[PDB]
């Protein structure tokens, strides 16, 4: 029924692109509409008041749904204001089951909030990654009430699975032929008019699917399961839609998931991105309440433990630590427990140090499927031990079905074993099904199809057996107990796609690095101020706000620069808010921290320089713009010296009128028309640039990737190299402490470059660099601008900085495994070094790098068009530096990169003599190993004055130091503090004490294993319950013994247990093959055998009603096999 007497709908248009809440939407004036109208430009929202009156002849039809098929997404609200269910307009999710109280002609009313955008944004249909069309209109197709025959629905699922079985089973085995015969018998037994023929057809299909496939009991057969199915809904935060649309997608997907889990007692759901949980908690309290109720009920498992599903290549180490810290703290404060699995199924590449951070965050398991997209080298493993640079290991599993949005097809279950690459060590696998990339979760079709698949595997055992009542934790616990035999993978998991993601949207990456550095600086300064002065409150509110915004902008589609324009407008607003809050915090801290107001006519005796770096520093500062001084010191504040002697840094023109020689005390740079034709190191008397080549050379390539414009740069792009010649050099600055020449290069019409090459005065025992800054007016189309430095250093391996250490990569394209790495990600420096000498290219805003046989190449700018039509148009400020260093790669490059990314800022002070002379708060002794970087000093998360009340708080003041060695050798250090120390302990990333370390006079010593990230805390001065069981945990058994496990369970509930109420193995290590009043206790027994190996085995069980629903506590059997 669809007419106006039965389904009457009014509409209200939201004012602009605003998204009003339910409170202020139902108070407006709705106007009558009907099916067939067209609604709104793209991204607008429309509210529908739908009044339904089920007619007299539909009141007893056994299934009533409201079919709503506006071709976009929507959300169903009850009259009260509770979200009920999502809807999607392609036909995927169009039905809302009437809640059994509409079965009387009382004309109940609901609301439907429709968002004028499809599941994948608003591209002009067909591509879904083309830039969104601002003038899309959506047609309301069908808005009717449908009485559906459940038997026809079940038969449809049955015959669908049967057809897939007849096609995908091997043609030479009897299973496919039997499936075909059953299909034929179904077809011949079905007649159009009759409805009993449907029941007869279902009975016929039962001979191949099993007796009762249409019930959850199919999962309680007690046979060995091989494929674990878990529901999943991957909502990208800002991929092809603004962030507000993501806020809406989260609720409109999790509401559908909660409704489904009400209907299907075996469905289990996982969703990551604690940030989305926070959005749901803030904006839709009822939806969050029902989600939390599901979480406590043992379904709807939150895993991932990170703030967002962040990219792991670009963000610095502290960003990754913050991701884990905030995610785990949110999960622990809101839900009871803390995640043990790192969920990251959509990230472009994984840094080599990720397993160490995971192990330090309490997460020993890792899941991902992105590496299946490699288009050059097939990744060779499915389940393996991923080993970090330091040796910490996690268990990584990559679902053999190569999607996180598996359609739960028969083919997907088949491929979960046919494509398993690690069958030698283990045969179990995870099938992650749903509709990801902004979509809603699993649909009822997928759940029914999985039921049919398990029925098939139980009756004709050729499909791998699929199981649905378990969790990801169970599967990984089963894996963990045989992980000593798994294959290991050392180092980074390089993703061989989306290599242009390191360069696209340069503004976002520059902002991310600036925000990271500023946050580190501010945290250190605020820690010093809060410890020094008791009246200054540590600004935890503001720090939390800025960190949350930064981490959100580190999402695996925002930072990688692969989103639409509106997303980047919102991210720009986020970064502007972050920097304004940082300015406020810094002003407060400077007010407290002595006094550091501003810069005036300088005096070089009332001004200090902020250090914020944990080692003695000595550089040139630019006070009194004509003159300059030397800032040297060890603490957070450095004094100045105001040198004046014979002139360093000469610049002289050759008679060529265009060539310059910038001579330092350590370097000599011969600059031709824009390029460094020669670079002579006066310490190691050798030329850095090979004869005949030219360093700092702008080159341009044609990008034009295959499909993903913003993501990919393909290998063939290396063929279209073209040098930009148009330089003509002239003097720009000639002060006796700094010289610099400036050049203009014409990329093309309407696109040009202005480059400044500068040399600073050398200082005693400090390597000097050649600094380059470019103003690029960039308006090219599908071009790729890079800069080249041939460095005359022969080595097969180049060193790059990653999060918390050094990765090492080939430079020769020997095999496909090395040709796939033609462009890599380096954070702050890339080093090419032979035995006694190296050259480091160190930057401040660029991540793309490529070393190919003596030619370093820094990726500067890309101009894609697909998701964003004006991606990098405009003016860009780029900085890099060439640093030729004696000796192999050592602490010099690390310290220089940190100094390059953190320029000193000057600050006046009323008394800049006590401030300088005071010993630093925290430092490392000079005799300690220089490889140690004391990356962050931060106040503890729970200090009774920083707590915020989220979690239980500790008593005193505490300071957290994160120090890591950056070079990869055993590092000994002594940390000196002037704070009055009460105790020191080693902590993990979540700040949980591990062991006490000894300290003497605020001089505790640290030993760091290679690439370790040790952290130190400085403390300054139907219900059912378990009763008992026969065989305890950890009892020892014969290798192939036959035994029985007997639990006893008490009711402790108001309701009563139904008749059956058995235990039905929703767990891990399979060991099968041999009513109750609210007062008393019932014993339950299972028959088990010990497996064929000496190990520990753990099986999880659960009480379940004899109709499918599981309840009560969780049970397990814990045994050890002696052999």
């Amino acid at each position: 029924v669809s007419g106006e007497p039965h389904v009457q709908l009014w509409v209200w248009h939201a004012p602009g692109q605003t998204r009003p809440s339910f409170e202020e939407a139902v108070s407006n004036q709705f106007v009558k509409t009907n099916v067939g109208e067209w609604f709104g430009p793209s991204w607008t929202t429309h509210w529908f008041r739908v009044v339904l009156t089920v007619p007299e002849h539909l009141q007893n039809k056994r299934l009533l749904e409201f079919h709503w098929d506006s071709n976009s997404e929507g959300l169903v609200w009850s009259e009260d204001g509770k979200p009920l269910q999502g809807l999607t307009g392609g036909g995927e999710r169009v039905e809302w089951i009437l809640p059994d109280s509409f079965r009387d002609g009382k004309e109940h009313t609901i609301y439907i909030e429709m968002a004028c955008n499809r599941m994948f944004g608003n591209a002009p249909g067909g591509d879904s990654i083309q830039p969104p069309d601002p003038n899309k209109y959506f047609r309301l197709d069908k808005a009717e009430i449908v009485a559906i025959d459940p038997d026809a629905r079940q038969l449809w699922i049955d015959i669908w699975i049967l057809q897939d079985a007849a096609r995908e089973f091997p043609g030479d085995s009897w299973e496919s032929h039997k499936a075909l015969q059953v299909c034929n018998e179904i077809i011949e037994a079905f007649e159009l008019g009759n409805r009993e023929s449907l029941k007869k057809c279902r009975k016929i299909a039962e001979q191949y699917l099993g007796p009762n496939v249409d019930s959850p009991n199919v999962y309680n057969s007690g046979k060995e399961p091989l494929v674990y199915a878990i529901g999943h809904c991957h909502i990208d935060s800002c991929w092809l839609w603004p962030f507000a649309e993501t806020k809406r997608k989260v609720v409109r997907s999790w509401s559908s998931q909660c409704d489904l889990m009400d209907r299907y007692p075996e469905l289990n759901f996982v969703c990551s991105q604690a940030q989305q949980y926070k959005w749901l908690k803030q904006l839709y309290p009822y939806a969050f309440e029902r989600v939390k109720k599901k979480v406590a009920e043992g379904r709807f498992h939150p895993i991932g433990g990170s703030w967002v599903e962040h990219d792991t290549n670009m963000p610095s180490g502290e960003s990754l630590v913050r991701q884990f810290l905030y995610g785990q703290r949110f999960y622990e404060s809101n839900f009871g427990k803390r995640c043990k699995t790192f969920w990251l199924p959509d990230t472009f590449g994984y840094s080599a140090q990720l397993p160490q951070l995971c192990r330090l965050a309490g997460m020993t398991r890792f899941l991902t499927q992105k590496l299946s997209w490699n288009n050059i080298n097939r990744f060779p493993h499915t389940t393996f031990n991923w080993v970090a640079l330091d040796g910490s290991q996690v268990i990584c599993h990559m679902p053999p079905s190569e999607t996180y949005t598996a359609e739960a097809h028969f083919g997907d279950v088949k491929r979960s074993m046919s494509q398993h690459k690690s069958l030698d060590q283990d045969n179990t696998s995870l099938l992650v099904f749903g509709k990801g990339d902004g979509g809603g979760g699993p649909t009822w079709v997928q759940i029914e199809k999985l039921r049919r698949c398990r029925g098939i595997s139980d009756t004709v055992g050729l499909l791998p057996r699929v199981h649905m009542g378990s969790s990801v934790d169970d599967f990984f616990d089963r894996l963990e107990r045989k992980a000593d035999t798994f294959v290991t993978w050392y180092g980074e998991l390089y993703f061989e796609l989306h290599r242009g993601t390191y360069t696209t949207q340069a503004k976002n990456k520059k902002n991310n690095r600036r925000a990271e550095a500023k946050l580190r600086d501010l945290e250190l300064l605020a820690t010093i101020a809060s410890v020094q002065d008791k009246s200054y409150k540590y600004p935890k509110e503001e720090f939390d706000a800025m960190w949350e915004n930064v981490l959100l902008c580190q999402f695996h589609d925002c930072l990688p620069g692969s989103s639409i324009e509106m997303a980047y407008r919102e991210s720009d607003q986020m970064y502007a808010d972050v920097f304004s809050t940082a300015e406020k915090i810094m002003k407060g801290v400077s007010q407290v921290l002595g006094l550091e107001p501003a810069l005036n006519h300088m005096s070089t005796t009332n001004t200090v320089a902020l250090n914020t770096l944990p080692w003695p520093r000595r550089e040139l500062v630019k006070i009194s713009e004509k003159e300059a001084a030397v800032a040297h010191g060890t603490g957070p504040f450095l004094k100045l010296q105001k040198l004046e002697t014979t002139k360093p840094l000469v610049t002289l023109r050759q008679v060529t009128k265009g060539a310059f020689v910038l001579e330092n005390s350590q370097l000599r740079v011969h600059v031709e028309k824009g390029v460094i034709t020669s670079l002579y190191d006066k310490q190691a008397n050798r030329e850095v640039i090979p004869k005949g080549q030219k360093a700092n050379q702008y080159v341009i390539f044609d990008d034009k990737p295959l499909y993903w414009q913003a993501w990919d740069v393909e290998v063939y792009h290396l063929d279209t190299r073209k040098e930009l010649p148009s330089g003509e050099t002239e003097v720009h600055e000639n002060t006796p402490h700094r010289v610099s020449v400036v050049t203009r290069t014409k990329v093309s019409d309407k696109s040009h470059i202005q480059t400044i090459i500068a040399l600073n005065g050398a200082v005693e025992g400090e390597q000097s660099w050649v600094e380059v800054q470019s103003k690029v007016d960039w308006h090219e189309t599908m071009k790729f601008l890079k800069v080249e430095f041939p460095v005359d250093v022969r080595n097969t391996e180049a060193s790059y900085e990653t999060a918390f250490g050094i990765v090492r990569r080939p430079t020769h394209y020997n095999t496909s495994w090395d040709m796939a790495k033609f462009e890599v990600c380096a954070h702050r420096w890339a080093d090419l070094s032979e035995y006694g000498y190296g050259v480091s290219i160190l930057n401040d805003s660029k991540y793309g790098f490529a070393t190919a046989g003596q030619t370093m190449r820094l990726s500067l700018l890309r101009s894609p068009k697909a998701p964003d039509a004006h991606a990098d148009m405009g003016t860009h400020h780029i900085r890099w530096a060439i640093l030729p260093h004696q000796g192999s790669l050592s602490h010099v490059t690390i310290r220089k990169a940190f100094e390059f990314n953190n320029p000193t800022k000057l600050y006046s002070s009323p008394d800049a003599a006590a401030l300088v002379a005071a010993p630093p708060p925290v430092w490392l002794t000079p005799d300690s190993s220089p490889a140690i970087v004391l990356d962050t000093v931060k106040r503890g998360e729970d200090d009774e004055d920083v707590s915020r009340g989220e979690l239980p708080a500790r008593k005193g003041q505490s300071v957290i130091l994160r120090m890591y060695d950056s070079l990869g050798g055993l590092a000994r250090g002594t940390v000196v503090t002037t704070w009055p120390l009460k105790k020191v302990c080693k902590v993990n990333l979540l700040e949980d004490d591990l062991e006490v370390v000894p300290w003497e006079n605020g001089r505790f010593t640290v030993e760091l294993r290679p690439f370790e990230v040790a952290s130190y805390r400085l403390v300054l001065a139907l219900e059912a319950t378990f009763v008992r069981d026969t065989v305890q945990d950890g009892t020892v058994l014969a290798p192939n013994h036959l035994f029985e496990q007997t639990w006893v369970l008490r009711n402790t509930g108001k309701v009563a247990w139904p008749a059956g109420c058995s235990v039905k193995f929703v767990g891990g290590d399979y060991m099968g093959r041999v009513a109750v009043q609210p007062g008393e206790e019932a014993p339950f027994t299972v028959l088990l055998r010990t497996p064929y190996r000496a190990c520990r085995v753990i099986s999880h069980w659960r009480l379940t009603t004899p109709k499918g629903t599981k309840f009560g506590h969780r049970l397990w059997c814990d045994v050890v096999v002696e052999k």
């Binding site: 910490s392 290991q393 992980a483 294959v487 369970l1049 520990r1096 397990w1116 059997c1117 814990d1118």
Partner: protein, 57 residues
Amino acid sequence: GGETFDVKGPRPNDYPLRAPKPVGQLISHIYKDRIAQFYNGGQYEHQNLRAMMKEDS
């Protein structure tokens, strides 16, 4: 054997923090071809099952 509000789960696994040694994926065809030498009458007649077949003669 089950939750009692004093124990949240089973005793935690002994998954080592550091990987002890690297282990590689076994090459399938080499291992497959190795098996036949355990009973074939080739050059290993005196070092495989064929040597153990006859107790005495």
